[PDB]
Amino acid sequence: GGGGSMFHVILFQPEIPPNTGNIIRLCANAGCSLHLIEPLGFELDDKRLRYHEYASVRRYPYLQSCLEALGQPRLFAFTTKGSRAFHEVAYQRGDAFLFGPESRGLPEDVRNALPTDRRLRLPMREGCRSLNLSNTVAVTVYEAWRQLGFAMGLPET
Amino acid sequence: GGGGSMFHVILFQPEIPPNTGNIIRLCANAGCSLHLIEPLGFELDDKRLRRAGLDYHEYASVRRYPYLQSCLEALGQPRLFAFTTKGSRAFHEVAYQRGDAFLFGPESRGLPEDVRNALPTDRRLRLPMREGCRSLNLSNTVAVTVYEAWRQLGFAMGLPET
């Protein structure tokens, strides 16, 4: 209902309002909770992407405040610097997924607080541009959701 | 056998440029060609793509057509799947294969009824959703669709398959 959701999506200092808009819609369709680590590059009444599709959007001053509030969930970081392909992991309910901001990496110190096998990467072809952040989150969430059989409800608390 | 990209992504009358900006990056990363059925809701041509920074290898795979049928003929009539909320079959039940083409409707309207029904029922696919939700963003739908099909092919990166 408000944190008993399937996965937790954590955006570290996101910068571009439409991306976060599209991630809110994605988390709604997939039953995930969304968490934003300040500072943000936009305020949360802008540009409404297109009542309460968004009310399930928490913001926090620091990564650690978010993770305390969530109960220290199993955490994976999704970075181009990953040591391991995202699809090799056995995801499970309550896992948290941490993504960096659009125009920069996730800080070195955040990435290195995670075990090596939990710094994950999507298949990035050589010489290519980065993927859009929202598409990255969608692909990550839908792969983890697929491993759970696209389960819709139980529990919906 | 006449497929030199992994998949073919076809946008029917795309309206919102950032969605197509995002899908160009996804197709480049996954090794897919991208085809846009006119009219578009925005400007797109090789000069604009070059002003963005794409060189010949990258924007040669981004092409426009007048009609859906003109596009399919240019591709050799590949197996075609259409991705819609009115689909009958869940998108993850298909066994995809190299050279498959994926058709997506516009942001505002979804595919024309006559386009959707031109396809066999078992190739009208839907993505899973919470009950009573609005569709996913068009570029998220494409990303999610392509990466599931690509996962089935082991994420083969530019493998020299015929």
Author numbering:
A (entry chain C): 1 to 50, 56 to 162
B (entry chain A): 1 to 162
From the paper:
YibK contains a trefoil knotted backbone topology. PaYibK also shares 65% sequence identity with one of the most-studied knotted proteins, YibK form Haemophilus influenzae (HiYibK), but contains only one tryptophan.
Therefore, we used an alternative enzymatic approach with S. aureus sortase A (SrtA), which catalyzes a trans-peptidase reaction between the LPETG motif and an N-terminal tri-glycine peptide. We determined the crystal structures of cYibK to a resolution of 2.20 Å. The root mean square deviation (RMSD) between the backbone Cα atoms of the crystal structures of PaYibK and cYibK was <0.2 Å, confirming that the backbone cyclization did not perturb the 3D structure of PaYibK in the folded state. The K d for SAH was 8.80 ± 0.01 and 8.93 ± 0.03 μM for lYibK and cYibK, respectively, which corroborates our structural analyses showing no appreciable structural perturbation in PaYibK after the backbone cyclization. The slower intrinsic unfolding phase of cYibK (kuH2O = 6.5 × 10−7 sec−1) was about 7-fold slower than that of lYibK. In contrast, 7.2 M urea-denatured cYibK showed a significantly smaller R g value than lYibK under the same condition (27.71 ± 0.15 vs 39.26 ± 0.38 Å). As observed for many backbone cyclized proteins, we think that the increase in folding stability of cYibK could be attributed mainly to the reduced conformational entropy in the denatured state of cYibK.
